[PDB]
Amino acid sequence: NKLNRISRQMLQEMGREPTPEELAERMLMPEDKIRKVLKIAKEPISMETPIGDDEDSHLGDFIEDTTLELPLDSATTESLRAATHDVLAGLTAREAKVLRMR
Amino acid sequence: GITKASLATESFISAASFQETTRVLTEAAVAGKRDELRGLKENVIVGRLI
Amino acid sequence: MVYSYTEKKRIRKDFGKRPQVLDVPYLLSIQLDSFQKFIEQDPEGQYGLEAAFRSVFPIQSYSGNSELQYVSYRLGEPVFDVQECQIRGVTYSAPLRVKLRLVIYEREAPEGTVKDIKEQEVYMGEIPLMTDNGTFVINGTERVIVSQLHRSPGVFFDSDKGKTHSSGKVLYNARIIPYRGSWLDFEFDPKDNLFVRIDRRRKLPATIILRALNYTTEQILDLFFEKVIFEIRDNKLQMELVPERLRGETASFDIEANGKVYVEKGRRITARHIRQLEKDDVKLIEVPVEYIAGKVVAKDYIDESTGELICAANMELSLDLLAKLSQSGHKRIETLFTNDLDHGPYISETLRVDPTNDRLSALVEIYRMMRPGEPPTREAAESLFENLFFSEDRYDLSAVGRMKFNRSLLREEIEGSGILSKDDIIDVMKKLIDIRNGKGEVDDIDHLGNRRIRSVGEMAENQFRVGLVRVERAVKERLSLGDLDTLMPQDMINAKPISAAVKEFFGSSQLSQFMDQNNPLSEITHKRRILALGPGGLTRERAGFEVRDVHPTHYGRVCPIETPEGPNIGLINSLSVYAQTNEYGFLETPYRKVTDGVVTDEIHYLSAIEEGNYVIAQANSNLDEEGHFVEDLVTCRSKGESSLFSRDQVDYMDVSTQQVVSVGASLIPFLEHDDANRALMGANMQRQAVPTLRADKPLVGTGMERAVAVDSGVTAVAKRGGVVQYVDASRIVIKVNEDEMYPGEAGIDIYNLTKYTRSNQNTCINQMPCVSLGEPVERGDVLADGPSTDLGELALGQNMRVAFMPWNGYNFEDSILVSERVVQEDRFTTIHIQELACVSRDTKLGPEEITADIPNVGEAALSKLDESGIVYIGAEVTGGDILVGKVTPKGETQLTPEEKLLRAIFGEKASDVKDSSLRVPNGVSGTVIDVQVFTRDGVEKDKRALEIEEMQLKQAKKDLSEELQILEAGLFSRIRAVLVAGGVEAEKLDKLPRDRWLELGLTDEEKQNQLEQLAEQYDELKHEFEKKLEAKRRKITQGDDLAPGVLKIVKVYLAVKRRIQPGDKMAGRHGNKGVISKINPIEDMPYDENGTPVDIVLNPLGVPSRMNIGQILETHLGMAAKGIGDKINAMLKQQQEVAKLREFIQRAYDLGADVRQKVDLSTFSDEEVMRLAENLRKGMPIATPVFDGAKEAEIKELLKLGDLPTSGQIRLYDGRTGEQFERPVTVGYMYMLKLNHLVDDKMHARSTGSYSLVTQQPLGGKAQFGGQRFGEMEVWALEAYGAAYTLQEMLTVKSDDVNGRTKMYKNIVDGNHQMEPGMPESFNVLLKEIRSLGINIELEDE
Amino acid sequence: VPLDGGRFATSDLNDLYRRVINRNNRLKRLLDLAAPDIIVRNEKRMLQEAVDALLDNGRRGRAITGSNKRPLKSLADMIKGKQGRFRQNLLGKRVDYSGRSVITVGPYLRLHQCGLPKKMALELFKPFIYGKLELRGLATTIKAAKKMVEREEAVVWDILDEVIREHPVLLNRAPTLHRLGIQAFEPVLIEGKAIQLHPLVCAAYNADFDGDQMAVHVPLTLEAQLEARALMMSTNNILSPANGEPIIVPSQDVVLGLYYMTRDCVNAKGEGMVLTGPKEAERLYRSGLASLHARVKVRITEYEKDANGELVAKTSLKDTTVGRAILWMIVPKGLPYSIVNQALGKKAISKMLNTCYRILGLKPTVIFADQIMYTGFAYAARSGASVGIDDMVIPEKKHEIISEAEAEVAEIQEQFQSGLVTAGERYNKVIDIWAAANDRVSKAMMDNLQTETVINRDGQEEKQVSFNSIYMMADSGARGSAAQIRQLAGMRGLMAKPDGSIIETPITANFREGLNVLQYFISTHGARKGLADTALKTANSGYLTRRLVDVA
């Protein structure tokens, strides 16, 4: 709220708008916190916000899953087991045991 | 008529598709209607062999 | 006039007869004019920023007698200019500085001010600015606001026959549509009861408003009905008779007066009986007491003695009721005049359905209609009714509304109050009833007199007005409590409120859209465009075919054949060639006034309603000498139709043969020969032509292309005439002629040319100089061509040799078979400029680095990058190359046992930073033409970014210095000239240093004062240079403002050069599409006896079905054109002489008889003629006017001069077998465009990409596009076939199953083709949504 | 879930769910505080309103989401939509292993295959390529295989030819109507980014080449390969399911070839001679001795299977032309020579394929169909057919007909000035005379255009059906029709003003001549209503199919 107040007068007082670091000296705190504070203060945007064409395409329809694992990768994991398991059968039983242990 | 006869379908999942969903779901949910699939539309929704 | 300098370079041969009386005005007129009126200082209420201010101002507080008025405004210089505003991404705008005056009246006045503080130009907002080309830059992007077409404000009377009630009988309804404020609707019903509804709200009986206007019933009856006087004189009922009242009625009793019986009972009263009464002047007759049984009493009547109401007004009298009012002493009883044919008894029956009685009741019943459910209040009802149509704030018709209103009511004043008056409503009701009565007609919405055209200026005014009202509430709110002298007109007026109203319009609005710039025609045809959609318009779903169709009023105003083909047809159209917005805002077109029997060349602009009654002749007509019509009757149109009209009847005549069409349609040659469907598509596709690498010229043409090139800003036009001092591929400096030069500063005009840069469509827009060192140029000449323009004409493509013949099916449907010669000549090649960006943001895990240190990349990868991590300028790149190195923190990787062993063996340290670096998209390859680095203020600019900043500084200094050097020399060169007058010393003057020249004076004369003038302006430039340099330097060094979270952004610019390949779309102007099928060697190309192959082989089968015959004519004449070229190409290789060439060229430009072209021997016989011939050797440019175009005979005649056959067909030989081809085939030159559908855009393929989070489904996240969408119809297609497994795999494993997909992939590499489908995640999610409600859904049994 | 720039985005349900909790919680608090009735009641109502908004919003107040005017979408609205359940409504879920691009011709193709862009096939079959690369040992492991195809090493191209060979692909167009909208083809590796599509199939897809795009789908599972090959394969649907007539009927260029092939002029090189068989007939033609169309007797051997499951053979001297003799080489076995002995228009050329199917079965008809296309394109190219401006012949009597028809209107007009005929009767009358005139001009240019080739064999004169290009197009069935031809040469129609009436001053000119200002302006309505009507009737048609497939 305190930030809004300064931004009000300084909007027309400065004729442009106070620079991102302008309200910072006016405010008590370390003043680089404006960026951090200004970010968390924003309200999240509705995931159903229609964008473009008026079509059923909605913002949420464009958000990809980043926590999944691509199969072209998962395939290489299942193979690498067979790989290290094969190459560990090529050694002496104690070298295989010692490396499987370490 | 075609649009009237298509209204009545034993499978509610099929009816829930092209008709008004709310009315179909309610009207089915009260009677405890048991959809056996057996049709095309319903099997496509559930994702098994036609 | 009588021919320019770039016309001496090349001249287009023009067939056609009709002289052009008027020439095409500025085609961008509307766009520029509109915004020019919006932002301007106008000392009156004429539309503009002044008017929107004068409406809401002055703003006074609530009763506090503290008023804030408005003085004047100004627009500060733009923060960034167009170029800088485009690069940085900000909006091109000017600060609006407005002086406000705050007056405070002494409390408990007589009104006088304690103090009035004038706040100097308080700043509110930055309003966007329009480019010299009529475009806006919102965020770094050129955007155009399309002019709008809506329903004109005023009154409109409709029918609604048919569908209603299915009884016929029609209906008659009136609608008052204000520019702002609520709607007032009047409508009838099958019972002839007049109804009213405000906006779309509940229906209400019409009369309920009259009571709300403070009208008692007696005055309502007195207003809408006439008075039938009944006299009781002596005893028993005499009556006054106006002899005309008996028309349309049959005698109900013995009609007798004046001792003579005029009509008996049962004899209808015709005009003859009426004549007798009129001529015998019978005022009073005797009537029976039973006739008033139906007659409705006019006013109230009471009993004088008992003071009791005998009968209320508007009540049906009876024989008994007459008795009870008779004994009370009443001589006169007024009744209504009612006739079911002429004057209808409607209003009378409307009162019986009226629930109200008095004014407050009606106001209550209206207020309870508008705001129902809440208790009504007197002040509330009064406030609402006065605020709807009577308040200057909430209601305006403005000028157009009031004018059409008054005009449609047959009033005098064309201008009046902007609100409604009681006289107005009453009058409107009278007109509606008059139409139902049979006198008068209903209008139609589709007429162009009721369709008004807005444009950027008008719309911007409305939005600023909305800004002023939402600021108004605030100003009053603060002035409520205000302290006297502390606050001033600064603390009150804010910026963001006003700035955000206007910003929300230009940024996102249905009328604000990206300019279509792939092409000059596309731009100019976009900037002239009309829309009936958007805010305040109808919608595609809402409105039917009535408004979409072409109307007779469209002539000369809206182009019939240029409109989009699709969801909205006829909802767009385009503006015509000569059309102009009327003074009042309608559409008016040029015409020629025919007085008596002569056709006068005075031009006259007629609006849609103005043109109606006059009889207008035809654009194609034969007149001669004095301009008398040759034929005794000529085809003309007068009122909505066309027929033969007599010699001297016609009031006017069409100005040109073109004016019916639009710039798009006017560029199609032989348009009169093409079916309208294909012509539409032609003018529709003509806008999609991407410019080419080598600008060619159209060989077949119209003659508008010259005008289109200049009027559109793509080219560079001479400001003033003179001789070119300097010509570079960068700039052009012109030395002004003294007649055109202003006295002070002397001068030269310096044109800074645009070089290779990104367009909106990702094409290349690049200017090239068309003039040579030391050449005379005249004002209004093309200095440099833009993209797709050649020597002042408009070239959207390249004409080429085409053969019509089936070639081994490779041309099958529309398919085009193109020789390899074309791709080798690189003529259809296109240059694309794509802007790729790399953003370094801030995450909670840490800041992202642009550093060049990237985990797991070889020396070959890091080669093309500098020390800083940005690719060098000019390095050619392909797919996979790293444009900008970027790395983002992701900590504690959490590896697994076998990955840990892998690193153990190979000893690699897995980084704490992950690689986000921007790499070139798959398959696209080009050369880097530029790099920009924007950095957040306070983060240290890296090495490369500093080099660029230092580079830009030096480059800026060089440019400004170049300016100052040429400028100063140009000025001192004038001082040299003025000193030589009055004191000439030639060799003496240029010896001493030039700086010391300013000391030498002159004898008393104006020449002494001229040296003074040049002195003043010199030093100004010296200082203007200084201040300009400082600002540029500061603009370079200033840290650009970025989005929240982004630390720095690196934008790389790649210029890809694509030529032509199978899959590209190609079409002529005639609506014949095609997609190149095979690129055939020159060896297999059909060739003629001379051995010259053909570039393209078209399939003839496309010509008859789709009727475009122009494409054949364009070919024929085209061939002929090339002939005249080839001939000249031989005579230039012969080097005959100026005489021989001149003869042949003259021969071509005449061509046998009666054309308007004229020609030479005024031209210098050597240097000017030889240059023209050199430009014609490629081909002889021909101009076919739209409907005035050439004729078969002329084409065949030009073919005789060509040496080529009349048939236009020759023998061709297959380049494969070498044997002849049976029958002759048509060969010629067709202009062909390359549209950008290009096959390496459309082409997409995906194996396994990213997936959507909300529903697991294929989605492109890398620009590796998500898979194709399999729809309902495709499912049915699989269902008709017996394929179950294809369908299951389609909607389960290939898409929606988060398990089945991976279990499938592992099987595909293992070599086992199976599917372990599982349940699609969509349905599995649907279960939870149902289960999220009170519904238990289970999967039973087993 | 978070976004770039540190901003967050979330579903509307949270805003709703949050509310239901708060008020609920508040109510619980309000119980332990012993609040007055008027409050806990209001709180109960508020809780009721909040739950309603969560379940189905819009049946009471339509609550709006935070900071955004647009009402927040509730669970009933998540299921609901257009229409009903998007989970398999249009449209319709995204699918892997697919692609798309502009399509081109490729006339060389057999009917069972299609040209596939190299890059498309690489990115599409990526897992198969990976699996195949290490089955033969060209790649050490799956990763190395990825690196190989990502490097595009020259060796991978041959492995792709293996995995493509027997592995059908599904092709689809934008407006899928009947089952032929998707057909299976055999991939043929093709350089370039454009899809090549067999010409004979262009009829079933209703796919022009004017820039229409098609989509490809890979049939992954084995059952899909055998479904595509045994059901969705191109060669297995040669006949429309709507009616047994072949939908693979040759379209335009091919039928103009065969029309020009079997046709006869009056006098031509090789007229009257005799040849042993089609082999030396083609040898006569290709060498340039004999013309493609000339009346000639040649010995042919036709076949009739009219025995019991057994092909009879019979040889005779048939009176035919050179083209029909050459064409006979294609006709397999038991078809009689009578089928090719005619002029072979588009109608007869279809029943040829039809009879061939109903007699010899499936396999012979396929190879037959291919051959017809190949020979059609080739010979059509030899023919050198074209269209010039002089190919459209206007009647010499046109202006005179217009004048006579122009007298009728002035006759009837004089009758209206004198009141002999009523206004309405006049309109019909004038309109009637103009209509008759149109028929006259149409049936004039039709006679002239059709037969006017007048030529000489050994005598003075004779006249046959014209060899003029545009007539051959219209006669064969390739393209154009008497209506469209009539608009080219003879006058075109009487247009109609928007209200539906028809203007009594028709278009007296045509496309070969110029149209003036008025005629084009009047023509505009027909165009605009045509485009509008088709674009609307297109939508109407689709809706009908919906109701139909729903009811069945």
Ligand SMILES: [Mg+2]
């Ligand atoms: Mg198409």
